[PDB]
Design a protein around this ligand. Structure first.
Ligand code: YAT
Ligand code: MG
Ligand code: MG
Ligand code: MG
Ligand code: MG
Ligand code: MG
Length: 81
RNA sequence: GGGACGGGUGAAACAGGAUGAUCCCGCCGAGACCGCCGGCCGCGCAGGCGCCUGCCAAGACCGCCUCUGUCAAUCAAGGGCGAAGGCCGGGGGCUAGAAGGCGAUCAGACACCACCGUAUUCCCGGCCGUAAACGGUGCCGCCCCGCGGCCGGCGCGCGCGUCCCGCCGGCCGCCCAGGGAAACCGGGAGGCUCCGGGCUCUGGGGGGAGUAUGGCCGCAAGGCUGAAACUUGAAGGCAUUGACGGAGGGGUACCACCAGACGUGGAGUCUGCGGCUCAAUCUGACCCAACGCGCGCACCUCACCAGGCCCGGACGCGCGGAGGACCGACAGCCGGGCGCGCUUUCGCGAUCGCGCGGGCGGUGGUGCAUGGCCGCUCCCAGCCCGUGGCGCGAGCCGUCUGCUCCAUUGCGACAACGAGCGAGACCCCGGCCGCGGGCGCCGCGGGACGGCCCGCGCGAGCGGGAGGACGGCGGGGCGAUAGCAGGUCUGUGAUGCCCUCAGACGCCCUGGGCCGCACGCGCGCUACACUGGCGGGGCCAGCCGGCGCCCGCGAGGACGCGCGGAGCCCCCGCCGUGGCCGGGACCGCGGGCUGGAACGCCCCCGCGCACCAGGAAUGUCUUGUAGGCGCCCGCCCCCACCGCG
């Protein structure tokens, strides 16, 4: 399914922003575990967790290949010079 | 010259062609016209103005230390010009073309389309004197934010280019203020309720009516001037939201189509529906959004028809009542039958009776008085809030003239910012795996997410390929705001207002009807046969589920115990294109079941209607789908061609 409601996008974002180092760009199992983790957030369902994780993956690689709008990745370091 | 069609239309048909058409070339004649350049260019009082050459007069503007000295502005009466069409008298006669004719189209078409064609269109002389003759805005005059284009003339500066800086006049575009009902104007429609520069003309709700009667002009057609009676409560202007469009641009769906399949409409029958009938054949619903639907009519159900018992009249006031209120019965008749009623004669005892008030009940009416529940708009994707801003205001922005999505699903912008519902998310079912448990396979979890590769695309996301039980909304449920005079008072101790209320529409019994049939159609069933019918045999389902022995051909029956699954299909044979062994409607004896009671339902023998694939018309459908085959439940004393599965 190609439906991506707002909730998925906003949640996947806040999650990537608040938690990068613990993750990888193309994985789906590590990202799924990170989402399932309690500190990061809470997902009542399973299908929701899977969808959010997938969107997290696609955002993460879209970022790692190149900086992405709306993402507070903490990248001033390389440009604050 | 050459040899067969040409013309014309959406498609055709009238007219032309072996008398040589259409087609190519050349020549001849006449009369109209003045193209591409041609324009937010220009000229003219307006109407209007475009070939070469030449002639005649005229005009605004610019430049000027040239002349005069108020000679000016606007205007009834009066005068002149005045598109096209039209008229009088003469010319000329190619195009087009009122009238007229003819061919199509149409229900008709004397109209739109095709073809032929008169006046007219052209010139001279003269009448007419009207146009959305529009900038729908009178003439003269002053002030007025800013930017820009073009035309003509003049001047300034320089690095001399047809440069850039200005002046006058003219034609235009945008626009700050300001104005206005607003659209809009802004080279005023500004400087005006803070309401006075000068001159002229017109109007006073809509029709009657620019009509009648007079007058003037005109050959005429007609023009200028121009009432009343009567009638009427609105007619109009600018703008807003919806609905509609034989309007445009994007999208979408087997209740749309393409490609195909299976059908219906043809016959007989089941069932419901209108009509006809009867004593009654009780009713509701009429495009999708009524017509096997309001869950199986011998009695009840049941409302309708013909007839009969009962009060089951609560509760308060007056009266009477045990010196007897009210209620039952043997026998005999009449009555379908009953002590219903009739002829006597016995019984019981205040549980009351009569009049007045007031109840209860009713498948009685109004669904256009209502609640609730359904259907439809809607097999959609849309709907609203707070702050702020634009408008006098109804209203608008937010809520998208971009790209994607099945989807107001998302990316990216924007006088908008920030939220919510709906959508998705969610719940049930199934497919693969793990753990546990177990009379009987049933409890908890995992797993799939546009995740991986490749292309593109800023992106959202699109196309392909993999591995995987399953690959991109697998099937159902729930279902936004707003609304319909949709259906239901015949579902109810849900109901407002009317009408029934002791010879009752109350309640109970006996029969009958709802099924009656010259007729039109809606959902279905069975068949038209060899891809078949008949006989014997073998054999596998799931929602789920009860069997033995003995009689009887069978249907069924008498006993006694707890135990259990089919059609198609496959195999061997008969038939052999004949309305034949296809098809089994209709009808005639008989044996049984249900039930108080067959009109209902099964079995046996016999008889053996149409029907040879069904016209105009029309329905449904994309994987375990269509179609074919059968099996269980609902209602039900018996009964499924129905419906949910
Ligand atoms: C009801 C009269 C109309 C129908 N007819 C005959 C059938 C026909 C068939 C056509 O091709 C499909 C056709 O082309 C469009 C025209 C016709 C005529 C046309 C009649 C109507 C006519 N006037 C109104 C609209 C119209 C539009 C047309 O389209 C341009 C047209 O074609 C020339 C003719 C017409
Ligand atoms: Mg003329
Ligand atoms: Mg005028
Ligand atoms: Mg005034
Ligand atoms: Mg007035
Ligand atoms: Mg008037």
């Amino acid at each position: 399914g190609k439906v991506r409601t707002k909730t998925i996008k906003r949640a996947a974002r806040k999650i990537v922003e608040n938690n990068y180092e613990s993750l990888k760009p193309k994985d789906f199992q590590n990202n799924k575990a990170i989402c399932s983790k309690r500190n990061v957030a809470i997902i009542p369902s399973k299908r929701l967790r899977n969808k959010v994780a997938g969107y997290v993956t696609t955002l993460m690689n879209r970022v790692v290949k190149g900086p992405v709008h709306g993402i507070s990745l903490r990248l001033q370091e390389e440009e604050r010079e």
